[PDB]
Design a protein around this ligand. Structure first.
Ligand SMILES: Cc1cc2c3c(c1C)C(C)(C)C[C@@H](O)N3c1c(nc(O)[nH]c1=O)N2C[C@H](O)[C@H](O)[C@H](O)COP(=O)(O)O
Ligand SMILES: Cc1cc2c3c(c1C)C(C)(C)C[C@@H](O)N3c1c(nc(O)[nH]c1=O)N2C[C@H](O)[C@H](O)[C@H](O)COP(=O)(O)O
Ligand SMILES: [K+]
Ligand SMILES: [K+]
Ligand SMILES: [K+]
Ligand SMILES: [K+]
Ligand SMILES: [Mn+2]
Ligand SMILES: [Mn+2]
Lengths: 500, 500
């Protein structure tokens, strides 16, 4: 099967790419696997495949770390991500985000039900597993549990059957047959849970599938609109209907080639201790345990030689930056365009710990609006910060056409030189905040509200008559034929490859 | 003579270091020399020495570009700068800034007058030169003049004789015997000029020396206190009295080994067109000419085979970042300590285009103050933004002890994750602003006032009981013996030198 449609095939692709290291000697899931993965993420090294995991029994489980992290070269920086989507490994971020947005103006392609698949090769009933006996990793030394769920997809359906959501939310082992995890507004797993709690009759039928089709885990990490079933969006994006099998113990459907599937229920009444967890902004607050959602596991099914993907998340760069930030930015780009804002591109700079999004403005269009910074900032911030797609983002940076928002250096340059602190900014205190950012949930103000800003790095003439500067750089401050002379004589004079 | 005390010796040092490229074929001062230098600066390449400059006559002049710019390796990144100061080329920024601050608590060592020196090898009187006939560079394609003065030292003395200031301020050729340049508050050349204008009797006796002792050009770029004669500070810093010769046409004293010296007057009455100039924040506004100060040149003296240093300034990284930013930060560190603020380190991140300074706080000391963010931000900002040393800096970022302020990645991480926009910041509108920043002089508000902010990236417990997190990074989220195991097995498992 194609790599974008089958996780097992994606692992092969990474090998062929010379983007995998297979560790075949014993590795401890207590911290060692995650430490190796952390190091990989901080150095943009090859993804680790742990084929000999201390505590692996009867097929459960191998681990692949860093499945969506960066490669060291510039030329295929985003190659792992491209491999989730059938794109060339040299794809740019713009190309990846355009692929992720392409289904937004296409008819869904609903999934196809098949009678079986590899995810049914093995099964364990409710007398035959114990989640505390599996080789679940301790990912960070101070975590409050062993986080089984860092790169699987939760599957829940609205009570009326009309919306089936796929999303990544963290979860850890609570006891032999339960997990606890985050289920928080405005996330779709939380919106669906609230519909079941208002109905009041039963717990939420649930499945958690690990090692799903890569294109599916991408959509699972993207804030596509409310009410949109991710399976049909992925179908449209890939041009193919996804093959799903029914769960054995409920009527949800899981990808046929899922590596591991948990089936059970998400409680509408019970909670349990959850966290702390080393998280996307780079922090853990040891001892900061709070009540989270509680999941009951009734059944495990799995592939022979099952592989569990794992995100060892924290400081730059891992899946929580490459996927959460970039995919939110993509959705924000579209949302702004659909609100008639002249935005061409959006990206969450890694340097901001994906808490900022830079919005590239089509300044010819802006000029025709005959508006001002204050009015335009307010308009942009009202659209983004009042929408779910803006949830994780606390600073928007508006930049003109000369800035490549996918280059953090250039965003930082524009922000630092074109946005006057205070005057060129609008603060938003009466919007939903992202409590996971340290300065929110561990900060001086309300954990769930405010703390957001639009920073206008458009210069005044960009609103009126046009850009009135040139950069003092090699590109802009020298004529073309001089530039080319310099480059052609560079190594001849004595001074110092694109792939590497 | 030692490299730190003689520019000609500094050029040799750079050669021996394998940090020079000698271009011996003809190079045009109209843009070509500056384009090559710009490229060097943007790529951290070797400094260019242009030994065959089209228009060089009777010894005037060769050019050295990029004299204070960065080297490519991490291990000797700041080596050019270290070579200005007799420090090892592997010196850290902390070590360089400590050297620059060391004279602040030492008695001055006043200069020594000698009867002659190399700067007297050649002379041109007021019938024998023409500044428009010298090979003065056009540095950026849209500059409003040919900027002869980008790395020389202006010498002016208070009317009472008690303070002789050395400083870098830009100047360009106006006509055969005049320059125009910036002379703006609160700079010491401007403070001294105002004293001569209040006296009202004559123009300011002036000299401009190019290719001065490297330790002297460092102090010239540093905001040492009002009334302090840079020559005696450099003497104290280096442990040696600097040798100076008298000018021929006035009673000022210039370094004996200066490459080129202009003697004349700075007018107390006349101005002339100045600018625009491609500047330290990375911009030029073509056509933005304004009236600047006017200098009359009466005499040129120079060394045989004189070398003019040149800064091709603009986007990262050149002398306007490495010297202006870092040396302001150094002075700000000291100023805060002298005001009883618990600051250990200060640096202007390059990523901020040297418009920010990050202040590392001794949080044990902070805790003993029993204060709050609002009060501490206000106190820090009042000290810094009301002082000349804070002139160029528009954002202060307060960080705790875990942050290395000399690492821009870490500053950006702390700012983005620990400072809640608005709530954790104090804006300062009633302080002097730096008009050169685009968002000031070309922005929405007053060019000369306000636009400054203190951003507190200290977390709440840093004021009370102590840091209450660990980073989710390899260093902090794994025990020492695991970490060392991982590193020792790294290349064995399959994964990927300090000098490179
Ligand atoms: C890629 C990725 C995404 C997420 C997470 C992780 C990864 C690797 C963890 C490592 C597990 C860490 C955790 O913080 N995490 C996570 C999470 N969203 C949550 O509500 N809860 C979480 O615990 N998202 C973000 C989301 O997946 C998206 O916000 C998505 O848009 C949700 O889908 P939907 O609600 O829009 O359908
Ligand atoms: C290293 C360096 C410093 C400066 C400059 C340059 C370099 C390379 C130019 C390339 C020439 C560009 C120009 O913008 N420039 C410059 C300038 N200060 C000015 O008032 N005017 C200027 O035109 N400084 C900054 C200063 O030299 C300091 O602020 C110093 O502190 C002044 O000394 P003092 O007043 O404290 O004695
Ligand atoms: K989703
Ligand atoms: K602006
Ligand atoms: K000075
Ligand atoms: K703070
Ligand atoms: Mn959804
Ligand atoms: Mn001075």
């Amino acid at each position: 099967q194609p790599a974008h449609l089958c996780f097992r095939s994606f692992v092969e692709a990474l090998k062929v790419d010379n983007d995998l290291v297979e560790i075949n000697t014993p590795i401890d899931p207590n911290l060692e696997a995650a430490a190796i993965t952390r190091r990989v993420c901080e150095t943009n090294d090859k993804a680790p495949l742990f084929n000999n995991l201390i505590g692996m029994k009867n097929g459960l489980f191998r681990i692949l770390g860093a499945p969506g992290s960066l490669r060291k070269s510039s030329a295929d920086r985003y190659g792992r991500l491209a491999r989730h989507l059938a794109l060339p490994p040299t794809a740019s971020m713009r190309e990846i985000l355009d692929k992720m947005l392409s289904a937004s103006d296409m008819p869904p392609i609903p999934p196809t039900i098949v009678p079986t698949g590899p995810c049914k090769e093995n099964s364990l009933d409710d007398s035959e597993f114990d989640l505390t006996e599996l080789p679940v990793p301790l990912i960070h030394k101070s975590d409050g549990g062993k986080y089984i769920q860092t790169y699987g997809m939760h599957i829940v359906q609205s009570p009326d059957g009309t919306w089936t959501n796929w999303s990544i939310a963290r979860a850890m082992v609570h006891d032999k047959n339960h997990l606890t995890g985050l289920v928080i507004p405005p996330q779709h797993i939380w919106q669906i849970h609230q519909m079941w709690k208002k109905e009041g009759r039963s717990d939420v039928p649930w499945a958690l599938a690990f090692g799903v089709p890569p294109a599916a885990i991408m959509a699972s990490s993207m804030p596509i609109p409310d009410g949109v079933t991710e399976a049909g969006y992925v179908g449209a994006m890939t041009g193919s209907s996804l093959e799903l099998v029914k769960c054995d113990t409920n009527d949800l459907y899981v990808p046929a080639t899922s590596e591991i599937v948990l089936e059970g229920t998400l409680s509408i009444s019970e909670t349990g201790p959850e966290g702390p967890f080393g998280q996307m902004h780079g922090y853990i607050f040891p001892g900061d345990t709070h009540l989270g959602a509680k999941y009951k596991v009734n059944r495990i099914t799995y592939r022979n030689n099952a592989i569990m993907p794992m995100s060892s998340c924290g400081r730059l760069t891992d899946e929580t930056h490459t996927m959460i930030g970039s995919l939110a930015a993509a959705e924000i780009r579209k949302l702004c365009q659909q609100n008639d804002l002249p935005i061409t591109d959006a990206f969450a700079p890694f340097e901001s710990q994906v808490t900022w999004v830079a919005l590239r403005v089509d300044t010819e269009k802006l000029r025709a609006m005959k508006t001002t910074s204050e009015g335009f900032r307010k308009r942009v911030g009202d659209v983004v910060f009042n929408h779910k797609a803006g949830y994780t983002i606390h600073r928007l940076v508006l930049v003109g056409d000369d800035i490549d928002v996918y280059e953090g250096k250039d965003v930082l340059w524009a922000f630092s030189t074109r946005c006057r602190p205070g005057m060129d900014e609008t603060l938003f205190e009466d919007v939903r905040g992202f409590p996971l950012i340290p300065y929110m949930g561990h900060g001086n103000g309300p954990a769930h509200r405010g703390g957001k800003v639009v920073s206008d790095a458009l210069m005044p003439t960009e609103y009126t008559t046009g850009r009135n500067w040139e950069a003092a750089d090699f590109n802009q401050s020298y004529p073309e034929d001089l530039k080319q002379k310099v480059l052609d004589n560079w190594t001849k004079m004595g001074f110092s490859h694109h792939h590497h």
